[PDB]
Amino acid sequence: KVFGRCELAAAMKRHGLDNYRGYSLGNWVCAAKFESNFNTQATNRNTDGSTDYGILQINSRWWCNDGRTPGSRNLCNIPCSALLSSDITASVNCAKKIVSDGNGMNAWVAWRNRCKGTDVQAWIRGCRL
Template identity: 55%
Template sequence: MAALVLLSILACVLVGNMGKIFRRCELAQVLHQAGMDGFRGYSLADWLCMAFHESRFNTDTVDHEADGSTDNGIFQINSRQWCNDYRSSTRNLCHMHCSDLLTSNINDDIVCAMQIVQQPRGMGAW
């Protein structure tokens, strides 16, 4: 019985940390609630288009780049500049682990993306 309880708890923890594929309208609602519609002049449509193009709305997408860096999460945030993947040299400007970008909770992804678009290149960074 104790083993079954432990297994159930472990399953919940693992499922809670797994990625998620958002539906378009669901993601639009999350981004809107986070204040991204109009942030730095970018519409909700801009954010949705970018997220679809980068990850197909999949939060656990990881792309390995030729320079050894990785693009991570729903917005494909690069480890060379923005997060630490512990494999490549990084500036870690968002002060986070790249693995944090791969979960179903995209609050940290949103905070980092908002930081990225405040840079001179704006959404051109993608």
């Protein structure tokens, strides 16, 4: 599924991401925009044997198990295919873990390069939440 900006904002809101660990909802929508262009089926296969999965491009070395990645830790305790659903629940639950496992939003390269230092509230401006 390819989400709309406001649709995604509301879904993330329903799942508790606004002000999760101090990160306002627009940070999360911004991160999804530049990680996957809001595509729940996005995959990026890395040359290091890992793969980035789903709307938040969660990586298979640390966070989910795809059975093909060396040094896999599966800290979200989920198969990576759960992150490719049209329902964003598994991705949000894992994203919460990624912040809770001590790193902040700097875990998402697209967030740090394209959202940090910008007006992230624009990503939810005009939306019904």
